[PDB]
RNA sequence: CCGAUAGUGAACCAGUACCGUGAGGGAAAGGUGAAAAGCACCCCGGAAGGGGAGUGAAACAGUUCCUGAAACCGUGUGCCUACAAGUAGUUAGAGCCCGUUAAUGGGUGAUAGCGUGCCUUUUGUAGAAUGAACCGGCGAGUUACGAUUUGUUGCAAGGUUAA
RNA sequence: AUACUCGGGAGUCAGACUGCGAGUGAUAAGAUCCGUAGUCGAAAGGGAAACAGCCCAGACCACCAGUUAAGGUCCCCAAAUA
RNA sequence: GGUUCGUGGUAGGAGAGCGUUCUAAGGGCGGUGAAGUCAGACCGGAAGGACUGGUGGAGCGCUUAGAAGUGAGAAUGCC
C-alpha cells in the first residue's frame, strides 16, 4: 500500500513555527528560519540556565560589598569574618538582609568584626 | 448600521488602487467623491463607482441619510493574476503579471 | 524568585561635590565611575541607574604623575583621510579640563545606552564654582 | 520504475552552461511524473511451516476449543430441504448466538445451503478443517460422523 | 519576625502565613513539616546561628505536592548531526509557614 | 485472532537507514564518507 | 547590479513611507455649492466660481 | 494495488494543444446542490461587479461553484519604537494591556548580561568555501533468488519434501 | 579490573597544533618527515580581549544554594585601592 | 526491591520506541456533527498524544497482531 505524505509534515512544521512566535519577521512565519531560530533559542536557554546562577551570585556579592563598606568592611573581610564566626547564611540571604533589614545585616557584620 | 459595495476582479494592479483608496479612508462621502474627482489616477473613476454604489446601497437597502455618511472602511484585496509573456532579446520570454483587484468600500452613518 | 530589583525613580539619587585638587586623574575617575553606576548602594541593580549625580570642582588642579602632562596623548579621528588630531593631557588640563575628566570617566562607564545616561549625571568645572547650588550638593571624600 | 514510464530517453537540456540542475530524463524519479524508485513488484507472500508443526497447530486449536467449552458435538445435522429459518431455529436450540464454524461430513445434506445466508456461520466438510477457519469462529459445531473423520487424519 | 531556614540545599527567608515552594519533601496534603535547620531569626532580639540557632524550628503545613511548568531542554552541535530534546518538570512542595520558634 | 502474540524474540523490527540522524543511520546511512564502498552498487568483487 | 539579499517586508514598507498621493487642493464653491480646484473653472456651475464664462 | 503531482502520457474530446523541416518530442486540466429549486423583483453601474430581496440544510454551495493549509497581500488596533551599532534570540527586567486547558498564567518589552544562521565538506568553516528566494506537494538501502550468521519454533541421529 | 578465544556488524587508510627527541630546511616557515606525550578531531564550560589544537577542566536534567581550578581582585567587570 | 560505579560525543555498532497508509480480529465513535482545517495558557523523557472551541459536512478511531510506495530542510532536485 502507498502512504502519501499527509498531515504529519504540516502538524510538525506548524508546532515549530508556533515556538517562534514573537520573533522578527520571517523568523515567526517560515518553517526553515523558524526551525533554526527555535533550535538556537533552546541552545541559548540551556546555556543561560547556567549563566543565570552565576549572574545572580555576582549581583548578591556586589550588594553585600556595598552594605559591608557602609560598616567599614570589604566583602572579602566580611565573608572571611562570617566563615570564622561559623555563620553559614548564603549570599542570596545576606543580599536580601542588605536591602530589606540593614539592621540585621549590621548585626551579622558585628559578628564578623568580632571573629576577626 | 453600515453599507458595503465591492468591485471584484477589476483589471488594475492592487498597488495602483491602494495609493488612491488611502486618500478617502475615513472622509465624509461628499468630500471623498470630490477627492476621487480631482485625483487624476486610473484607480479614481473605478473607486468612485464602488463608493457611489456603497452610498446607493446605504440609501435604498437600509434607509440611512446620505448627508451623514463617512467612509468607515476602504481596502483593496488582490484578485486572480492574468499571466502573460513579453518576448525579450535573445529568444527569452519575461513574465508579465496583469494583476486584478477586489475594491471594497464601507460607508457608516457616524 | 525573590532578589530585590530597584525600579526607576525608586532609589534616591543624591548630589555630591568632589574636589579634584591633587588627585590622580584615574583614582579620581574610578571612584566617580562607581558613584555614577551606583555600586556603593545595596539597591544596586545592573539594568536601572540607582547611582548619584557628581559635580567635580577644581579639575584644573587634577594630578598627572610622571611625564603624563606631556606624554599622555588624546587622539580624535574626524573619519576624513589623515584626519587624526592629538592633544597632550597637560595642554588639555590647562585649556579644557572639563573635557579631560569627561574623557577619563567616559572610559570607565559601561559602553551602552545606560552608560551614556550615567555620563549625563557628571558635571565637571575647571574652577571652584558651579551653578547647581539649587540641587543642595553634599561634599564627598575619596 | 524510470525504464517502464512512457517517454524519457533524451537529456532535457545540455549537462553544462544553462545554469540548471543536471538531469538525464524527464522521467528520473525526482521529476513530477517520473518512475517510482522501488515500490511494490508482484510477488507471492505464501509460505508453509513443516507438516508436523501444521498438524500440532490444528490439534492445539481444537484442544483449545475443548478447554473453553467452545466445541459442540451433534449426533447428526440434516435438513429435509434448504431452509435458513430452520437453520437459525437450530442455532437457538444449541444456544450458539455468536459466530460458529459447522463441520459436517456426508450423510448431512442441504446444510451448506441452509446456512449460506447467515452472516457469522460458515459450513465446511470435515476434510477442510483449517487453523485459520477455526480461529475466525468463536464456537465449533461438529457432527459425530465429522469427529471420526477428523480423528482419522490426526 | 522572620527566620532563615536551610531546605533543599538552599536557604529561604520565611514569615508566618507565607507560601513557599521548596524541593520535594516527604509529606501528604495536610501533613505538618518541621525545619530544625534555622540559620537566623529576625525582628526584635536577633538570634544568629553558629550555624543553626539551637532549639529553633519553623513549622509549615503541606498545601500541594506538584511538578513545575514543563521545560524543554534541547542541545545541538551545528554541523555534527547531533540534537537531543528532553522534557523536564521539577517536583516541588508548596508549604504554608505556621510559626517561627 | 485479536490477541495474537508471536513467540518472544522470533520477530525483530528491520533497520531503516536514511531516515534522520536520531536513528544513528541517517544521512550516510551507515556507509561513512565517500570512496567506492559509499557508492550505489559500489563494492569490489568478493575475493 | 543585482540585489544581494531580498528586501524584507519592514524595509520595503519603510521605503514606501513617501510613495503616496497628496490630497487635492480644493474648496467648496458659492454658486455651485460643490467642490472645485482653486484657480480652475467650476464645471458644475459651468464657469469660474461665481464669475460667469 | 493507485486515488487526480498518484494511477496509463492520457479519469477531462490526448497522442490532443504545443514544439520541431522532419523522424520525433509531448503537456496542463476531476468535485455547485438531494434536486436547478441556476438568484423573479428593486437599487448603484455603460458593463463588469456589487447590495438587497428570494431559492436552498447551507450561497462565506452562485455555472470551473466540496474542503480550502502555507507562502504572499491587506485593513483594524493592545504593547513597543525617531541618541541608536542589532545572526535578531536568550537570561535578568520595570512599565502598560489582558485573563487561561488556573498554573510559582498570557501579550508587549524601556533597560542590562550573554550570544559568529542551517547544511555540506573539511586538519580547521560565522565563514570572504558549497547549497537553498519563499511556501506546498513529490523526491533516495527495495524486491527476487542464493550464501552466511543470530534469534525463534517443530522434530531430532535424524530433519525435510520439490515438481 | 581488565585480558584472551571464537562468531555477527562496522567505520577509518587527507589529519591538525602544542611540548619534548631527531632528520630535511637556513638549528627559517602556521614548512616537511618520523618518534613520543597531550589536546582538537569527536569536547560544551572557565581563562588567554576576540582566538579548533595553549592553561584549567570533562556538560544526564532542574535550583535566585555552597566550595574550589586556571586566571584574577582601581573602573569597564565578580573579588584587596590587601 | 536496595547499595556501588557510571550517563560529552563524529564515523559507526547495539537497544528500546514514536508516528504514517493498509489488512485481520475484537471492541467502539459519528448528522446530538467523521476526517480535514484553524486556535489555545493541557499531557508524556523524546519521537509525539489529548481536551475544548470555531470551520467542515461524512466518515474515523482504539486494542492486539500483520504488511509496507512508512516520516524531508538542503540534491544549482521536479512541479
Ligand atoms: Mg559556584
Ligand atoms: Mg528572434
Ligand atoms: Mg527509456
Ligand atoms: Mg542563479
Ligand atoms: Mg506515473
Ligand atoms: Mg529498530
Ligand atoms: Mg543498527
Ligand atoms: Mg552515530
Ligand atoms: Mg541532514
Ligand atoms: Mg556526502
Ligand atoms: Mg576521504
Ligand atoms: Mg569508506
Ligand atoms: Mg497524471
Ligand atoms: Mg486534491
Ligand atoms: Mg471552493
Ligand atoms: Mg550622543
Ligand atoms: Mg529615544
Ligand atoms: Mg558576508
Ligand atoms: Mg545560492
Ligand atoms: Mg539470514
Ligand atoms: Mg603542518
Ligand atoms: Mg610531536
Ligand atoms: Mg573528520
Ligand atoms: Mg573547548
Ligand atoms: Mg571569552
Ligand atoms: Mg567547529
Ligand atoms: Mg570562596
Ligand atoms: Mg567590582
Ligand atoms: Mg560527564
Ligand atoms: Mg552519550
Ligand atoms: Mg483516512
Ligand atoms: Mg517515501
Ligand atoms: Mg522545497
Ligand atoms: Zn461654481
Curated annotation (Swiss-Prot), chain A:
Physiological role: Binds directly to 23S ribosomal RNA and is necessary for the in vitro assembly process of the 50S ribosomal subunit. It is not involved in the protein synthesizing functions of that subunit.
Record-level GO cellular component terms: cytosolic large ribosomal subunit
PROSITE patterns per record: RIBOSOMAL_L20
Keywords annotated in UniProt: Ribonucleoprotein, Ribosomal protein, RNA-binding, rRNA-binding
Similarity comment: Belongs to the bacterial ribosomal protein bL20 family.
UniProt GO molecular function: rRNA binding; structural constituent of ribosome
InterPro entries on file: Ribosomal_bL20, RIBOSOMAL_L20_CS, Ribosomal_protein_bL20_C
Keyword Signal: no
Pfam families referenced in this protein's UniProt entry, alphabetically: Ribosomal_L20
UniProt GO BP: ribosomal large subunit assembly; translation
Source organism: Listeria monocytogenes serovar 1/2a (strain ATCC BAA-679 / EGD-e)
Protein name from the UniProt record: Large ribosomal subunit protein bL20
Curated annotation (Swiss-Prot), chain B:
PROSITE patterns: RIBOSOMAL_L22
A Pfam match: Ribosomal_L22
Lineage: superkingdom: Bacteria
GO BP terms: translation
GO cellular component: cytosolic large ribosomal subunit
Key words, A-Z: Ribonucleoprotein, Ribosomal protein, RNA-binding, rRNA-binding
Single GO term (MF): structural constituent of ribosome
Function comment: This protein binds specifically to 23S rRNA; its binding is stimulated by other ribosomal proteins, e.g. L4, L17, and L20. It is important during the early stages of 50S assembly. It makes multiple contacts with different domains of the 23S rRNA in the assembled 50S subunit and ribosome.
Record family assignment: Belongs to the universal ribosomal protein uL22 family.
Protein name: Large ribosomal subunit protein uL22
Biological classification of the source: Bacteria, Bacillati, Bacillota, Bacilli, Bacillales
Swiss-Prot record, chain F:
Residues of the full protein shown: 3 to 49 of 146
Sequence ranges of Gly residues compositional bias: 19-29
Record keywords: Ribonucleoprotein, Ribosomal protein, RNA-binding, rRNA-binding
Protein task: Binds to the 23S rRNA.
Gene Ontology CC terms: cytosolic large ribosomal subunit
Protein name from the UniProt record: Large ribosomal subunit protein uL15
Similarity comment: family membership: Belongs to the universal ribosomal protein uL15 family.
Subunit text: Part of the 50S ribosomal subunit.
Region listing for Disordered, in residue ranges: 1-47
Biased composition (Basic and acidic residues): 1-16
One MF term in the entry's GO annotations: structural constituent of ribosome
Gene that this polypeptide is encoded by: rplO
Domain of life of the source: Bacteria
UniProtKB/Swiss-Prot annotation, chain G:
Record InterPro entries: Ribosomal_bL32 (IPR002677), Ribosomal_bL32_bact (IPR044957), Ribosomal_zn-bd (IPR011332)
GO MF annotation list: structural constituent of ribosome
Signal peptide limits: none
Keyword annotations from UniProtKB, A to Z: Ribonucleoprotein, Ribosomal protein
GO terms under biological process: translation
One matching Pfam family: Ribosomal_L32p
GO CC entries: cytosolic large ribosomal subunit
PANTHER family named among the record's database cross-references: 50S RIBOSOMAL PROTEIN L32 (PTHR35534), LARGE RIBOSOMAL SUBUNIT PROTEIN BL32 (PTHR35534:SF2)
Family label: Belongs to the bacterial ribosomal protein bL32 family.
Protein name from the UniProt record: Large ribosomal subunit protein bL32B
Organism, scientific name: Listeria monocytogenes serovar 1/2a (strain ATCC BAA-679 / EGD-e)
Organism lineage string: Bacteria, Bacillati, Bacillota, Bacilli, Bacillales
